[PDB]
Amino acid sequence: AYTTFSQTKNDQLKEPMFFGQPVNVARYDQQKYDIFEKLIEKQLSFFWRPEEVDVSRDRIDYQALPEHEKHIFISNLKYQTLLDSIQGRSPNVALLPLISIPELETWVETWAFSETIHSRSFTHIIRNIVNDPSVVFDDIVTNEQIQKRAEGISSYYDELIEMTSYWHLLGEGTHTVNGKTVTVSLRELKKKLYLCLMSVNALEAIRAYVSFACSFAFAERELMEGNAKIIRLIARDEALHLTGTQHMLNLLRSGADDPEMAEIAEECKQECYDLFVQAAQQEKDWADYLFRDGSMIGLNKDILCQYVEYITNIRMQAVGLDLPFQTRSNPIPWINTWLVS
């Protein structure tokens, strides 16, 4: 029920962001919500090439670092590599099949494309600070701790994709597949979408930022400055990605785009609160692990867990969820020097 070019003439300004008629013509002269055109323009103006960044002196730095500090650094780099590996492909695979307005379609493709640049940057860093990159890469997939913190990310995406396939194939209704009954509900799919967007928002809004803090702590000590420069470019991209999902979510819950989604958001609002808190919880558990055999000069588990709570409150506030933590001021205002956004 999906087509790469819907032959029906439709007003793209009147379609919902999702589940409407698949986008046929890709035009940018007009838009239902110009936030997406704006984001595309900004992301294109930020285009950068990891290769052009010199990380030459990061090798001696990483080598001179205390063992436990190497752990903190490489562990964080590995998780970041995981995040962008998924973000490079997922928005395309998961969202393109459901988008019904061209600006959002293009935004998603541009967003995903920018994530592949991020992935490319990590290979650039790893290659210049370690002799055998394979060691690093072949420890991301099985790393028990990394799967633990990354828990739930792929699942949300995968269930959305599966429901989407059933929806496009069988359509709305009650069906039979090899003796088993399979119910396909649009309302359920919409919920799956919403939960998935919330999860991606938490990924780019908090998970990425916690890793930035870990990375810039070294930059503060004039260490791993090659990596620092690259992470600064990535955080600038992430600021945009974050804005994109916040708008998607706020537009979906406000009821202007799809009344039914507005209803759905309200009722699973508590589920969303829980998934957000769980994400922050995983970040905390990770922190506890990062500094088990040694804290870092300028960043320890305590300060880091404070930051998680601090940014979590802000992000959740931005998408209409209650604040789970105690309000406080930024525990690490020095981070602002590196977050040009």
Closest by CA position to 242, among listed 35, 47, 70, 62:
35
Residue 15 found at the interface with Fe ion (CB under 5 A): no
User: In 138-185, which ranges are continuous DSSP H helix?
Assistant: 144-149, 153-170
Half-sphere exposure in the Cβ direction for 128 (13 Å, CA): 20
Count the site residues for its own copies by CB under 8 A: 72
Specify the stretch interacting with Fe ion by CB under 5 A; choose among 32-40, 84-92, 94-102, 257-265. Answer: 84-92
Contact at 8 Å (CB) between 312 and 324? yes
Say whether residue 17 binds Hg ion (CB under 5 A): no
Could you tell me the smallest distance in angstroms from the CB atom of residue 203 to Fe ion? 8
- The residues in 116-145 that bind its own copies, with binding defined as CB under 8 A, are 116-117, 119-120, 123, 126-127, 133-134, 137-138, 140-142
State yes or no: residue 61 binds Fe ion (CB under 5 A): no
CA dihedral sign, ordered 87, 70, 276, 303: negative
**Which DSSP letter does residue 91 get?**
I
Confirm or reject binding of residue 245 to Hg ion (CB under 5 A): no
Nearest to 104 by CA among 23, 42, 29: 23
Which range, of 59-67, 173-181, 207-215, 232-240, touches its own copies by CB under 8 A?
A: 173-181
What is the four-CA torsion angle of 64, 206, 201, 104, rounded to 10 degrees? Answer: -50
How far apart CA 200 and CA 196 sit, in angstroms, is 6
**217 contributes a contact to Hg ion by CB under 5 A:** yes
Q: Which is nearer to its own copies, 31 or 243 (CB)?
A: 31
**Interaction between residue 323 and its own copies (CB under 8 A):** no
Least Cβ distance, residue 111 to its own copies (angstroms): 10
Smallest gap from Cβ 198 to its own copies, in A, equals: 16
Residue 179, interface with its own copies (CB under 8 A)? Answer: yes
Q: List the single partner that 272 binds among its own copies, Fe ion, Hg ion, none, CB under 5 to 8 Å by kind.
A: Hg ion
Q: How far is Cα 222 from Cα 297, in angstroms, rounded to an integer?
A: 12
Min dist CB 91 to Fe ion, Å, is 9
Q: Binding-site residue total for Hg ion (CB under 5 A)?
A: 22
Closer to Fe ion by CB, 115 or 309: give it.
Answer: 115
Is residue 228 within 8 Å of residue 265, measured between CB atoms?
no
Task: Report d(CA 192, CA 173) in Å as an integer.
Answer: 17
Which of 75, 80, 81, 199 binds its own copies (CB under 8 A)? It is 81
List of residues 6+ apart from 290 with CB closer than 8 A? 71, 72, 75, 76, 214, 301, 304
| Contacts to its own copies from residues 153-172, by CB under 8 A | 153-154, 157-158, 161-162, 165-166, 168-170
* 232 is a contact residue toward Fe ion (CB under 5 A): no
269 binds Hg ion per the rule CB under 5 A: yes
